[PDB]
Amino acid sequence: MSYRVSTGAAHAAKGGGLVSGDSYSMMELGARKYAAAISDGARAHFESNETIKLLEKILESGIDEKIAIKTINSILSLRTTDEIYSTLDLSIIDLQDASCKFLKVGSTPSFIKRGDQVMKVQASNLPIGIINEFDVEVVSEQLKAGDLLIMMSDGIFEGPKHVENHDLWMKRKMKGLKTNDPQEIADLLMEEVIRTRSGQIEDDMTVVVVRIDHNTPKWASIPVPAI
Amino acid sequence: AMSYRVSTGAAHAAKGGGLVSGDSYSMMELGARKYAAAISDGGARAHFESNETIKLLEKILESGIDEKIAIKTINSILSLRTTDEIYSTLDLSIIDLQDASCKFLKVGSTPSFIKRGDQVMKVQASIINEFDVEVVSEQLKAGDLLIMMSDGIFEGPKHVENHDLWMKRKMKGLKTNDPQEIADLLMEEVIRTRSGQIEDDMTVVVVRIDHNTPKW
Amino acid sequence: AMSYRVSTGAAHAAKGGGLVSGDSYSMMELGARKYAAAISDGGARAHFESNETIKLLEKILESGIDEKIAIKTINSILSLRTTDEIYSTLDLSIIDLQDASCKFLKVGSTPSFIKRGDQVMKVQASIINEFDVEVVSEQLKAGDLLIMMSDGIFEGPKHVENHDLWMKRKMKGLKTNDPQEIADLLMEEVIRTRSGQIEDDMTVVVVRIDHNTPKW
Amino acid sequence: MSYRVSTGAAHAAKGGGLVSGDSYSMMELGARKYAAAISDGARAHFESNETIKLLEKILESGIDEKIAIKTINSILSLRTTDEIYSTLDLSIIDLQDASCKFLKVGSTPSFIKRGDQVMKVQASNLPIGIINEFDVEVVSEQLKAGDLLIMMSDGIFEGPKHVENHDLWMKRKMKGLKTNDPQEIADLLMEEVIRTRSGQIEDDMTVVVVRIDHNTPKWASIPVPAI
Ligand SMILES: OC[C@H]1O[C@@H](O)[C@H](O)[C@H](O)[C@H]1O
Ligand SMILES: OC[C@H]1O[C@@H](O)[C@H](O)[C@H](O)[C@H]1O
Ligand SMILES: [Mn+2]
Ligand SMILES: [Mn+2]
Ligand SMILES: [Mn+2]
Ligand SMILES: [Mn+2]
Numbered sequence: 001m002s003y004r005v006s007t008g009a010a011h012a013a014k015g016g017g018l019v020s021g022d023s024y025s026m027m028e029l030g031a032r033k034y035a036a037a038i039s040d041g042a043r044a045h046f047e048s049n050e051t052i053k054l055l056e057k058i059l060e061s062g063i064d065e066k067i068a069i070k071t072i073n074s075i076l077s078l079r080t081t082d083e084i085y086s087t088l089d090l091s092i093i094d095l096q097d098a099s100c101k102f103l104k105v106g107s108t109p110s111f112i113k114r115g116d117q118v119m120k121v122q123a124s125n126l127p128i129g130i131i132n133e134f135d136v137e138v139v140s141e142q143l144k145a146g147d148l149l150i151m152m153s154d155g156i157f158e159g160p161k162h163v164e165n166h167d168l169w170m171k172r173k174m175k176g177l178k179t180n181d182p183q184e185i186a187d188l189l190m191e192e193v194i195r196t197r198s199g200q201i202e203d204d205m206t207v208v209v210v211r212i213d214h215n216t217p218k219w220a221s222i223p224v225p226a227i
Numbered sequence: 228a229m230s231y232r233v234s235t236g237a238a239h240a241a242k243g244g245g246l247v248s249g250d251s252y253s254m255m256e257l258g259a260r261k262y263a264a265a266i267s268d269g270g271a272r273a274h275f276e277s278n279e280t281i282k283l284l285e286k287i288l289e290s291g292i293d294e295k296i297a298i299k300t301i302n303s304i305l306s307l308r309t310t311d312e313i314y315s316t317l318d319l320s321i322i323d324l325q326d327a328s329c330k331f332l333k334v335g336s337t338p339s340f341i342k343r344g345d346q347v348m349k350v351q352a353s354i355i356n357e358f359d360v361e362v363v364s365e366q367l368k369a370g371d372l373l374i375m376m377s378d379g380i381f382e383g384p385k386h387v388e389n390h391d392l393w394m395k396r397k398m399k400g401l402k403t404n405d406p407q408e409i410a411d412l413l414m415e416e417v418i419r420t421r422s423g424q425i426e427d428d429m430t431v432v433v434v435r436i437d438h439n440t441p442k443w
Numbered sequence: 444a445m446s447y448r449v450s451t452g453a454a455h456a457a458k459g460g461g462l463v464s465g466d467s468y469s470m471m472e473l474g475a476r477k478y479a480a481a482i483s484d485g486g487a488r489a490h491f492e493s494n495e496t497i498k499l500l501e502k503i504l505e506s507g508i509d510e511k512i513a514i515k516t517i518n519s520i521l522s523l524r525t526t527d528e529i530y531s532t533l534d535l536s537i538i539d540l541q542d543a544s545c546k547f548l549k550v551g552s553t554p555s556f557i558k559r560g561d562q563v564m565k566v567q568a569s570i571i572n573e574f575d576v577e578v579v580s581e582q583l584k585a586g587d588l589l590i591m592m593s594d595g596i597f598e599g600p601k602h603v604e605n606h607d608l609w610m611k612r613k614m615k616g617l618k619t620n621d622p623q624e625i626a627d628l629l630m631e632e633v634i635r636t637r638s639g640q641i642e643d644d645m646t647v648v649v650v651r652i653d654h655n656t657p658k659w
Numbered sequence: 660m661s662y663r664v665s666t667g668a669a670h671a672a673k674g675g676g677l678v679s680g681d682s683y684s685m686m687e688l689g690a691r692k693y694a695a696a697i698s699d700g701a702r703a704h705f706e707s708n709e710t711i712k713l714l715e716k717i718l719e720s721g722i723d724e725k726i727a728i729k730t731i732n733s734i735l736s737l738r739t740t741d742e743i744y745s746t747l748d749l750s751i752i753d754l755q756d757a758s759c760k761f762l763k764v765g766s767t768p769s770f771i772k773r774g775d776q777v778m779k780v781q782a783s784n785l786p787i788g789i790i791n792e793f794d795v796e797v798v799s800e801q802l803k804a805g806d807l808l809i810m811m812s813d814g815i816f817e818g819p820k821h822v823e824n825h826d827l828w829m830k831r832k833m834k835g836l837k838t839n840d841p842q843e844i845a846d847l848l849m850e851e852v853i854r855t856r857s858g859q860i861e862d863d864m865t866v867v868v869v870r871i872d873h874n875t876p877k878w879a880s881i882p883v884p885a886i
Contacts, residue, residue: 002325003324003438004236004437005322006435007406008406008409009258009431009433010430011430012428013425014425016425020430021315024258025257025258026255027256027275028253028254030237030239030252031325034321035321035322036373038318038375038432041313043311043312046257046276046278047276048263048276049272049276052265052275054499054502057519060519063512067512071516074506077506078506083271083272086249086267087267088265089265090264090274092261093262094260095232095260095262096260097231107266153250153268155268182236183235187442190441191443194240201240202242204240204249204250205239206237207238208235208237208252209237210233210254210262211234211235212231212232213233214232215232217411219414219415222418223423225422279495283712286734286737289737290730299720300716300720309525309527311525446670447752447754447871447872448871449870450872451841451842452841452844453663453842453845453866453867454845454849455690455866456853456865457864459860460860464865466863469689470686471705472684473684474668474682475754475755476754476755477752479749479751480867481747482746482766482810482812483746483748484746484766484812484814485744488708490749491711493706494704497705527700527702531700532699532700533696533698534698535694535704537693538692540664540693541690589695591697593697593699622665623667625667627876627877629669631877634881638884639882639883644679644681646681646697647670648685650664650693650695652662653662653665654660654662656660657850659849
């Protein structure tokens with residue numbers, strides 16, 4: 001079955017704010033590895049791929065998204081015959097301002113529950129007029145305190161044995177959620193389709209869910225002395 | 228100016244159920260800066276990884292050698308660091324999600340703590356050690372609670388002669404299992420001992436282990 | 444105190460002769476510091492590689508995109524460097540040993556030169572460019588001679604208004620094909636124009652291409 | 660057939676010596692890639708593996724070689740099932756003082772021609788009393804101006820169809836060398852065994868050869884002014 005971990009953290013800068021000589025990070029290799037690090041003294045403890053780093057750079061600098069798609073596609077071609085033959089689904093949240101960046105690569109789409117308005121993650125203009133070898137999508141939303149972001153592989157977005165518009169099927173099981181708990185939602189959705197064929201599943205299944213919070217904890221309020 | 232925080236969960240099954248899976252998933256978080264999550268239908272190549280240096284330190288960890296040889300060699304690596312490294316202190320916890328073993332690397336760090344039920348043990352082990360490296364492994368159990376910190380937190384409390392003790396007492400006092408709450412409480416406690424004054428940067432990270440096993 | 448220098452050669456054939464080979468070999472040299480050579484009977488994993496940063500710059504090179512997009516992005520990468528990088532100038536030449544194509548990355552560097560027979564061409568190409576990045580490719584030919592340098596060499600000559608010209612003239616004058624001799628001669632020339640005075644650190648690197656094809 | 664490259668370099672430090680803000684390096688992926696870099700401003704342009712880095716650290720710090728062998732062996736086990744299943748033959752020359760370090764891993768031995776004294780690279784005491792899974796050897800010689808160092812894969816150290824002590828066979832073709840040229844020697848040795856079965860070879864063949872030089876070039880003599 002494999003262990004899950006649940007985690008939390010808290011941080012505060014000397015004098016009551018600005019920047020800190022403390023850094024911290026963590027990462028999970030789904031079902032295999034969890035790591036956490038703390039440091040006191042330029043370096044991040046963890047990073048992406050190598051190809052993901054690259055596609056990230058681009059995702060950043062000015063670049064008109066139509067160009068970037070082209071460009072990502074070109075780097076994607078550099079992959080060792082062959083690893084890019086799969087689907088890459090990547091959301092990257094900036095924790096300062098809640099801005100999200102999506103990077104899809106031949107992948108099922110993903111959804112944001114907000115209140116209950118469940119908009120789907122689609123890029124405003126699907127650019128025509130180029131070669132998109134790897135069926136590469138790229139998107140920005142602006143996330144808000146409370147949003148539930150859900151992500152899955154084909155093995156679950158399609159699972160629904162009664163096929164036919166899985167889009168509006170998902171938003172259905174999504175709008176009908178008592179809970180607000182990432183791990184529950186995940187564990188639910190998993191069930192809410194396995195049922196659809198009893199046990200034994202066709203494909204591989206994974207879903208991840210992420211909730212954005214902006215709570216200010218009591219300790220954040222405690223004032224620090226004047227100069 | 229509060230940073231956004233993120234809470235996350237995931238679920239996963241193989242074909243038939245299931246030797247392995249060509250599905251794979253990862254997430255990582257740079258504290259207060261960045262969160263990323265990734266799914267791949269292949270999966271092979273891990274989405275995220277330790278930076279360089281670390282990646283070597285991890286190899287030495289996985290390799291069961293004598294503490295003494297580990298420490299020598301870890302010292303070699305960290306000696307060859309750049310002005311900005313520096314190499315500060317490092318506190319690294321790596322947990323095997325299959326058996327819940329855990330390796331611990333501390334490079335001049337403060338200690339950390341595990342809260343098994345009502346006990347609170349502290350993570351330490353037993354010549355030259357240029358950067359003050361300590362390597363430890365432990366077997367964790369469901370419901371265990373791992374607490375790491377900077378010295379800002381662990382050395383924060385005013386007029387206290389035994390930080391180990393102060394910390395164990397506070398942790399025995401927790402009436403909660405939620406690692407985010409625990410992280411906030413401890414932060415609250417330490418601050419209130421100075422009177423809002425934050426002598427140093429303060430970081431606490433809390434990890435709970437779960438072998439919960441769901442309907443499906 | 445003279446550094447040791449190394450001269451090297453290698454030969455290689457496959458099974459039957461031969462689609463590919465599970466043999467593999469590599470060498471690398473850190474100038475004046477270190478030489479390493481490696482053989483593997485497998486071979487898969489390359490013994491040596493570009494450091495991080497570079498490895499990305501190389502990906503962007505291999506990827507045929509618009510100079511303008513390359514340059515933007517290369518600038519992004521090198522902007523995120525550490526105090527000590529810094530990121531100085533970089534002059535990178537990567538040659539495909541299969542077709543002899545060559546990519547060239549110059550990050551604020553001085554130019555470099557190819558001597559085809561009696562000609563001496565110079566390696567350059569044609570808004571914002573934060574670190575002054577230039578990307579170029581060229582097809583090389585047997586007997587070509589590639590010359591890279593720091594500014595210490597290329598800007599070394601006293602009271603000279605056209606370093607391009609000075610350099611082409613010296614290179615047309617070489618009565619030798621040996622890249623070590625060429626490297627020493629040019630170094631000699633530049634020094635003698637100051638009178639032993641070395642205003643700056645001086646580096647010259649010379650690469651000759653060979654499609655020689657031996658008895659076997 | 661693939662191109663070879665031949666290369667040379669020259670360097671000198673400001674003021675007439677000490678250290679320099681210039682660095683340079685190069686590397687060759689045999690038959691596939693050559694790279695050269697120059698910089699002006701901690702970073703080396705090129706590096707080893709990741710596992711090789713590690714085995715290098717050890718090879719350095721004090722460690723009694725018997726321990727190191729053990730230790731290398733342990734890291735070697737960490738390899739992805741499976742890449743270490745092959746043979747690793749690594750010589751690492753320090754250019755300041757000509758000291759060599761060998762690291763063999765289930766690999767044919769290597770030789771140094773010196774004048775004509777052709778000693779073979781063997782470690783003074785083959786340590787017994789442990790598990791050497793990967794048949795791992797480790798050696799230091801002190802190299803001198805003029806030494807020819809030769810390295811090959813099985814495909815050529817064994818090639819000799821008339822088998823039976825290939826050790827003393829190699830030193831035979833080695834002592835009988837008019838030339839002093841790395842690439843000739845290589846290209847010779849290759850031939851000097853292919854002949855032994857006409858064309859078509861059993862295995863894969865590679866040999867590399869390295870000559871150590873300490874020439875002081877004229878320019879090194881030209882004096883720089885007093886202070
Ligand atoms: O319990 C939630 C946490 O899981 C961890 O594996 C992730 O890295 C993330 O930083 C958190 O969201
Ligand atoms: O021509 C000899 C040179 O070959 C290059 O591929 C190597 O990197 C080495 O630095 C030199 O020995
Ligand atoms: Mn699938
Ligand atoms: Mn501190
Ligand atoms: Mn200079
Ligand atoms: Mn072989």
